Design a protein around this nucleic acid. Structure first.
Lengths: 190, 68, 38, 104
RNA sequence: UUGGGACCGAGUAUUGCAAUUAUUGGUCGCGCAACGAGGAAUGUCUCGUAGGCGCAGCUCAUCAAACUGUGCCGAUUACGUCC
RNA sequence: UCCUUGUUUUGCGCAAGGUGAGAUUUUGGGCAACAGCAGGUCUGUGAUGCUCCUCAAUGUUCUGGGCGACACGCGCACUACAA
């Protein structure tokens, strides 16, 4: 025993975690698996993508732009490091920081083109739960690639930085500024 | 912000034409028995939705479509 | 190379698996036992 | 040329009038004879249902107290006018001859 | 640039009926020659797919950035509308 | 097929879940009607009309050599290598 009922990443515990928002609780789920490495079929149906945690989803959408890129196993190698970094910076379980950052970097309202007459018109359009999740993830992990693109000296560390500042609502993060500026058009025009 | 939950009470139907946005109805479960005569606002939504989904509302008193 | 069911030597010679049937195209010149089903 | 319509798109019968007064449009200001012009009756609400609730809350002497009035109008439209907002549409032969009289 | 190769000179072996950089899996120069994800425009795929990667067949003196087939690593979004 | 006893006015059927290796044109391919286009192919053929080449033949040649591959740094299509 001691790995039957107990579930870890390898030292990070899922008891501590709580879903930060109450808007999201069926698109944010908890991890139990010891790596976020995928091997299943992850899509076949409109919602079957929300049966799984944010961790797995994030690690898969972490980077693209192939040339001989090592995909999943490589991504997992960076996950490990970034969790340790986030842990000692927040002085708290890194997992629960991820839970927060995905929610608080997400745009919660949008506005779209939908008008006609040779002209566009914008209205306040609420962001759906799954979209808050997805959009947040993509923006955060877009930031990463751009930060290391010719720049910094940091390899995993930029991810940890972003996830911290996102959870704080600080506008250093690539995700936060998007939520901000979009809502300045979508709550200033209806 | 304001984060005000509501349950998608039903799929109101299809509005828009892009294949992007749907128009759906939100019921307030945010209230604790505070007066609301609104009482279920229609809201335009971005991306896929499903019934019983909670979502935060940044706005209230929305009639969505209007005449425009 | 060169072909034995034409003397053209051009319009392309098959020598795959020791046969020529592409100086007389095999669609026209079948009954070699081949079939297409997939 | 060909008699497309027997009554000629009019409620005016042959050999009676030959002249019926012009009437303006509430769209483009076009004039046409009254009989040709396309009448509808609107019965337009002064509040949406969604807002009706909210206002009837704040009311005591109105809403619940008396049923809300509506703006009534007659709307005489031009031909082109009607068709473009698709409240009159083209119909097959068998149907074009049908009328519903002045009832809705 | 120690990231990339494309030009350029010298040597040698291999293939062949015949090589005239044919050879090229090779040495070792030039790299400090381009190019830093690249205006307008525009392509095609919703799942073991896209993308990434390699091998063989094919042609046949000799060469595959091509074509055809097998395998490996393997997602994000959408699962709606008709504009 | 069953089941949700939902949706199904009875029908044709629809959705979710279930059993299950596998949920509907099982899955992926291959074949395919009728009407045609002055599409392409006379350098695939012993598949061909006519009329051109028919001997200083241009046809034809294990004949020799050359071309199709050229470079004002010119446009386009497709490919591959990178930052």
């Amino acid at each position: 025993m001691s790995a039957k009922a107990p579930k870890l990443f390898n030292k990070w515990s899922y008891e501590n975690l709580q879903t930060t928002e109450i808007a999201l609780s069926d698109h944010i789920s908890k991890t139990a698996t010891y790596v976020p490495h995928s091997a299943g079929r992850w899509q076949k149906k409109r919602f079957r993508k929300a049966r799984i945690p944010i961790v797995e989803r994030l690690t898969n959408g972490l980077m693209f732009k192939g040339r001989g890129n090592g995909k999943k196993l490589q991504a997992v190698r960076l996950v490990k490091h970034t969790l340790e970094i986030i842990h000692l910076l927040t002085d708290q379980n890194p997992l629960q920081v991820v839970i927060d950052a995905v929610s608080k970097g997400a745009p919660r309202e949008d506005s779209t083109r939908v008008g006609s007459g040779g002209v566009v018109r914008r209205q306040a359009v609420d962001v759906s739960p799954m979209r808050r999740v997805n959009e947040a993830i993509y923006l955060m992990c877009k930031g990463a690639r751009e930060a290391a693109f010719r720049n910094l000296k940091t390899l995993p560390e930029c991810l940890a930085d972003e996830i911290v500042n996102a959870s704080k609502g600080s506008s250093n993060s690539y995700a936060i500024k998007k939520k901000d500026e979009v809502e300045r058009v979508a709550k200033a025009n209806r | 912000d304001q984060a005000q939950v509501g349950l998608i009470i039903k799929v109101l139907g299809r509005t828009g034409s892009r294949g992007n946005v749907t128009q759906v109805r939100v019921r307030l479960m945010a209230e604790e028995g505070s007066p609301d005569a609104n009482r279920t606002i229609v809201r335009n939504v971005k991306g896929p939705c499903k019934e019983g989904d909670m979502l935060s509302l940044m706005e209230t008193e929305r009639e969505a479509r209007r005449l425009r | 190379r060169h072909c034995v069911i034409c003397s053209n030597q051009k319009a392309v010679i098959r020598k795959y698996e020791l046969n020529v049937c592409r100086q007389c195209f095999r669609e026209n010149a079948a009954n070699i036992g081949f079939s297409k089903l997939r | 040329m060909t008699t497309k319509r027997r009554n000629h798109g009019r409620a005016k019968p042959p050999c009676s009038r030959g002249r019926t007064r012009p009437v303006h449009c509430f769209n483009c200001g076009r004039l046409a004879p009254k009989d040709k012009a396309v009448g509808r009756f609107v019965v337009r609400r002064m509040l949406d249902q969604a807002s009706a609730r909210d206002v009837a809350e704040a009311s005591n002497v109105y809403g619940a107290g008396f049923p809300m009035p509506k703006l009534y109008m007659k709307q005489r439209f031009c031909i082109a006018c009607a068709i473009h907002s698709r409240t009159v549409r083209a119909r097959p032969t068998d149907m074009r001859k049908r009328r519903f009289t002045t009832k809705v």
